[PDB]
Amino acid sequence: DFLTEAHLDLPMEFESIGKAGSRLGTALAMAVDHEINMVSLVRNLEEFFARESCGWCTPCRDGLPWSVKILRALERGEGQPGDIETLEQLCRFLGPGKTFCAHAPGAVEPLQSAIKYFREEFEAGIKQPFSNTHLINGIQPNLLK
Amino acid sequence: DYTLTRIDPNGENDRYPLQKQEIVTDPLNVFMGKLNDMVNWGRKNSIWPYNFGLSCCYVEMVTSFTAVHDVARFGAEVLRASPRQADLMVVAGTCFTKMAPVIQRLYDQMLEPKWVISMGACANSGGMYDIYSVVQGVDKFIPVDVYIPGCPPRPEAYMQALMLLQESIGKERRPLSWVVGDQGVYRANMQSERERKRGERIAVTNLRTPDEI
Amino acid sequence: EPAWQTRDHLDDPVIGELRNRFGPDAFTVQATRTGVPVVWIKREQLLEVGDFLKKLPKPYVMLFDLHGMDERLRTHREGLPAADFSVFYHLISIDRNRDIMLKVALAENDLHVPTFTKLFPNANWYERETWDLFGITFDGHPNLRRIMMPQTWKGHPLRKDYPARATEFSPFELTKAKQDLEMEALTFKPEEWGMKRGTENEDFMFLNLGPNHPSAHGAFRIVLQLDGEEIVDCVPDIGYHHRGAEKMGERQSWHSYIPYTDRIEYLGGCVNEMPYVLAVEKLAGITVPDRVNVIRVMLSELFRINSHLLYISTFIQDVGAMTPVFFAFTDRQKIYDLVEAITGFRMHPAWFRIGGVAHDLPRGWDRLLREFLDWMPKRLASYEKAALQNTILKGRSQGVAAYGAKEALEWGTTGAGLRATGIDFDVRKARPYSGYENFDFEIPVGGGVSDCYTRVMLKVEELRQSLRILEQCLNNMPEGPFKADHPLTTPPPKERTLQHIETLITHFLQVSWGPVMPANESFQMIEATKGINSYYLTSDGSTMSYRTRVRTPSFAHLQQIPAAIRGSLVSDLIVYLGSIDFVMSDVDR
Amino acid sequence: ATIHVDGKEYEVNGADNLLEACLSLGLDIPYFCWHPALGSVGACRQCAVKQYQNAEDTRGRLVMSCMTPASDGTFISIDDEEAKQFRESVVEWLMTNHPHDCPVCEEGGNCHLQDMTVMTGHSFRRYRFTKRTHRNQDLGPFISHEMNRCIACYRCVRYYKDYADGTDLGVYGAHDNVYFGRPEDGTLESEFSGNLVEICPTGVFTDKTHSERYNRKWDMQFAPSICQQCSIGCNISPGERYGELRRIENRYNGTVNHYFLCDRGRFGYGYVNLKDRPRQPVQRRGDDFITLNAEQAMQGAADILRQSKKVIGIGSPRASVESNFALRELVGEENFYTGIAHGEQERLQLALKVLREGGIYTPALREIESYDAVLVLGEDVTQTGARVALAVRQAVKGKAREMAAAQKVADWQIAAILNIGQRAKHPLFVTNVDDTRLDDIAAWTYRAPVEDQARLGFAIAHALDNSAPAVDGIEPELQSKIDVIVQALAGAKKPLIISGTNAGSLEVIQAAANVAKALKGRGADVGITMIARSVNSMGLGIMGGGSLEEALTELETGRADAVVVLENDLHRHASAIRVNAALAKAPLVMVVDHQRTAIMENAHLVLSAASFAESDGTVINNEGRAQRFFQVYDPAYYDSKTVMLESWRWLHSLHSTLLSREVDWTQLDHVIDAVVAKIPELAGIKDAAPDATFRIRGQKLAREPHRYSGRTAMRANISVHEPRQPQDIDTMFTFSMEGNNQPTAHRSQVPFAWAPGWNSPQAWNKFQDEVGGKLRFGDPGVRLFETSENGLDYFTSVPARFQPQDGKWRIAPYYHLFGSDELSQRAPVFQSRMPQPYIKLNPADAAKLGVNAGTRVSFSYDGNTVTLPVEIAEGLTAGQVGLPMGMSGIAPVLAGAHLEDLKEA
């Protein structure tokens, strides 16, 4: 998970980084400067994680590419309402125990932490209204409210 | 191109209808044909329906009787309550199994000439009621002259079947008197309406979308 | 808590009253989605329980329904007493605005119940039909013969082992011997009904008023014992319009049965569709949106006006004035312009769906509704002044075939006859459904006498009130979906079906194998055009109904006929038949 | 074990996983990757339930029910909100790439993915991006491939590779581009590839033979039947539409075939739909052929039979017990002949004597999977009894199962079991004239002539028990292999000995009996299996009768002037020259058959019999189980001119018209009672199914689903008047949907599996007591005989070793799953699958003849000089030529015969 400047005064231990909603991991930290768009960074991360899926289990293999396409739309400014909620539900449903191995929980840790700490950059990509259907002439749609 | 029917209610045949039909040629001279045409014209322009209904199809038929349709214009509004004064039996409704002897009795009590229109899917075949208490079509025991599909056919569909019956009556051959001549009833084998209308029906390309009024 | 949730109704005071009177172990309460306390009682205590309910402080006065059920193939009977067959008794307390359903379990060999005819005289025809269709004997029944099937019928068709389709049996072959046999079986036998052939001075004439009579409203025979023109007694002979519609309910999927619901009361249309789709939506756990409620109410009121127009004009025609039927059918054509535009069909639209309606409203429907609402009131005032205020019509109808509140309650009479007795009971106000509580409309009531004239004029006022409801429907029409967002909405919205795979999968399985309703029992009561119409649906967990019981009001009214007309002239009976507002599809189902 | 599900207490097996325990209780958990026969792997993640450690726990945790043991004290919730949302999310993730294909997909209405999409309640699509796509492969004539519909559940590869031991199917690629199929285009080489169409929960693998004339499952008329293509007796659900047999589905029998068929049974049904089948009785007058109805055929045949001095009957192992018995009653017991040759009959009665008099239990097909060591002698099981080969592969995997059970690994954790076992397996030793398809898993394969295979069996029996007769002249290398086999079989707790009649030698069956007796004398739980040839070979052997050679010499001597041949082409069991001469000499030949055979060119009367799809009857399989097959459809429903009756109905009415001059079409149960009264050894066929008066609460059993469509239109072009549904006076099934097919109905004969919400083959779960177990009121079928108290004596007739002699070539039988069975080789889809005709030669013999691979050689057998291209067989022993039995012109009676004048021409 991503951490902010306030977490920089944290000892690099498993327990202390664990209580801050992250993982000590390999203890090889990576700094993100102000010039880096967080949506593009998480898109790069999720592209890596989706293409490195082994394909055994449904949530990782078929839900990481959905997050990749959502983040690609957000980076282009083609996000639609419900995209961020879909990302949050994907983070919830790819957690530990939902998938066969721990590749997908690790995949969704940066996405959920970046949405938690930098939500304003993700909402900046939502510009178009949600549209999943085209018009079929002769059939009146069921207009939800 | 004619079918000849001869009735035999007291013969060696138990299954209804008590008749025999055979495909023959037209029996039709310069005066008998003209007077037969005059009788056919008079019969087809004065068709008195029997006030008889079984179900919802009867509601549509009597709707055709009212002012918004005015089946009186064709001369077919007289609507006799007695089978003796009626010329046309419209089986307008389901042929219920309990009602089938009644329908047979009422058809028997009608007098010559008589025509039968089976109105609606129930009378045609049993319709949607393939069920224990329903005869699967009134033509299992009543000879039917015109079939109207629909559930119900709209009043103008009943009027269209009335015009179809008029064209069938206008070229039929019936005994001019019961004392002298052939007494069997000759009905022309018409071209089917499906094959007649196939050319103009298949050529349809676009219809109005179902989104407006 | 949604209205469709399963409830046992233990908080109903009638449960505590039955517990205090009979003990806690005397009966078993079943949790259903009927909205009604369902109580399984022992067969030996049925008459005691019925008497106790009849003499409660705010009593259960009307036997709404009585029928049977074949439970032998029901796999989900958890919490239910062991039963091969069962008989249920739906009783209504009007003053409580409550109802109860008693259930009696029966073994296969011991298929007999005590008769309910002493407590409720309208139980006679219900027990005759339950004997006819299930083979359940009712001990002490004065004449327990077949009522839907001919006398020479073998078997009981609503049993699970009786085949439904006509194509299971040999095709109908009318021979001379068969015609003579069934015509002998149809012949009235006055000795079997306790009638003499006459007195010493004169003979009684036994007259067939039907099935082919201009005043019989379909396939319907009343056998009149006539002393001159006085009716000594009559026997209404029904079952000539029996279509096996409940058996067909066990034979069609939940979706494919809707057109059959249309043809139960064939002048009703969408009114007949409404209780069935509401009961299925209770089984499915569906709460339809507001626009669906308003669309269904508008179609129901249009068909109520259609049916009332036919009823008023045919009453006037039966009284003798034949002119207003032409104009009234023109008004029906204006309604049909709107109804054809919306649903694509005149008489049986089949347009309501589980979870909504088949299509959205077409563009320009409000123009047609406004045209009809401008057209109707001057026409109705003309009918009133020309025919209904004629004193000869009044002399033919006022005081004719009159009964009071007690006679209406004891025969299960509902609708305009019951409210003509002064009892203010309409389902749309007492037990509101489909958003009827959001409309302002009055319920016309009579002065205490249910006359032919009073019933007709009450229906005229009901027509005016339906015009008010249609005005509110036209002016305040919600924007929104015409189908619910539920997964069991059958079929799904068509455009999403045509482009989305999961919607296509749902549509594919819903139209082919059928929507799966989880095992439950559901009930919906509505104010139909001719009285109270109800659907009682049992799902066994399949895509087909395990049991579809349709309560129709015309059955009760036709059973009431001999009590209310005995000792009158034949012309009074003609006017009475014209003022009942019945069709025989409703009677025989 | 006691578990709690949604606050309800249940008693389950603690050795089961939670998914199979909850499905056995009738609860609905969606699943894809788990299968009852394949174990759990936890791939699809669809079967999530919430688990709680205590009753006073409210947080919980989502787990895979297929990967979680159903131990004592577990609390789970299926209807938990998080579990329902996650299962819906798994379905939605599978839907993101799924093609918009249901109208043009053969799985629609039978699709597990459709059912689970509906079951989770997912019906709204919010994914808006692109769907991945795949190209397809050509997989041969039987299986159609559409990889767009794949949900990557891995069921196909787990079945094909782990279960069926196939090698040419696999998974390729990576993350969301995983591909399931062959490494290149080509026919799927497994004999059990057809089970993929039911194993795959989507429309990726579909039945191509059904796809040619496709109809949906609700439109099908089903019946419970028995596969007719070999002696194993796998239960099938044939389904028809518009008067043609459309599909063969697996009908679950927990005792015989459970979930799986072989490809011969699944795809070899096409002979039923041949347009050259007899549909009416036809009488030959000179060169003219006159079509008769049933009564004129019976009267004319009875008149000619009354005029005849002696009428003999020739039965067949193709025909049912009732038909063979009806022929036996028509002609008399002393005038009845089985249609098989003398040697075939000797081998069949020896196999029957070993089965019902050897004192050694014969296992059912499912029971074969529990044996600890297998010795197959002579019988090329994959080509002749294929489902036994599949069961033997499971028995071989039993060792990895035992090793994993020693490490406290649950029996459903299939991946851990396979990891522990690695390449370890139970001993399998197979003997044949050449290599077998079982050689990949066989501990040893002996390629030798049939006498040498019998001698190896006799040596194994002598080394197991010294009282068994010894065979002298065994090489030390063969002796060392014999000691290997003996040490394997003696250390086995449950040894199994498989043999059969297909090797064409009596001594191989005798040696197998000797080995089984020697193992039984050591106090081992030994089983013996005999593989017969045809569907009712064992029934014909129990009934008995003279050989075909005796019938031929009765016709040739003139002592018989009338012969009635029942469902027999007579060329498979005798030389065609002799058969044609004998049938031309006879003044009256009547042939009762459903296929256009070659002996109807000389038949004076041909009775159009029904095939198994249009008939009811009983057949006895290879282990002596009487099984009833039921009629699927009435052939006269569309074509009213069709007079196609059951063979026993024809022959019973013929006997009645011969005796009392009157026609009696009788009922099936009357014929069955006549069988069990006249033949006491066939008395068990009464209990194979209940009689025609059986009801489920007063109603019959439905042959078609409740949503069967088109009733008022499917015959409307013939006549707008709907007829009555055809009546079934013979059985308890009705030819309509107006009947019972409830999964809780107290019956054993299930025509098809359907439950609300379960339209796929996964609906068989609801019809079982526990999933993957037995049908919940017992599997249909009954064993005719029990294990005898006493066994046989040792057979002392040890043959000498095979000796090649000049100019004389011993015919080694080579059977083919596609080709060696008569009726299924008549099917048009088998022609592409069938091999090109050939003759196998040793390299030394081919070099001695101066013949290379592919050259045509001509040989003469019984006045038939036929030519065949040469294929070189490394494993075939010199002095033999390999011939494909049962093909066109190569009768199976040629097995073990000799050959003359084999020259290059």
Ligand SMILES: CCCCCCCCCCC1=C(C)C(=O)C(OC)=C(OC)C1=O
């Ligand atoms: C004759 C001029 C037009 C008026 C049409 C008749 C009025 C409406 C028919 C009413 C009716 C119904 C519904 C009806 O169902 C019925 O039974 C068949 C009748 O008896 C013959 C009826 O009279």
Ligand code: SF4
């Ligand atoms: S979470 Fe692990 S097991 Fe599942 S597909 Fe991804 S990498 Fe493979």
Ligand code: SF4
């Ligand atoms: S065809 Fe339809 S409208 Fe006509 S009687 Fe039958 S159900 Fe009624």
Ligand code: SF4
């Ligand atoms: S595999 Fe199933 S869900 Fe997919 S297209 Fe075929 S029927 Fe539809």
Ligand code: SF4
């Ligand atoms: S091809 Fe079928 S069985 Fe194989 S992984 Fe795909 S969906 Fe599963």
Ligand code: SF4
């Ligand atoms: S093993 Fe034999 S009985 Fe079984 S499916 Fe194959 S051919 Fe049929």
Ligand code: FES
């Ligand atoms: S069935 Fe359990 S994860 Fe697939």
Ligand SMILES: [Ca+2]
């Ligand atoms: Ca049969």
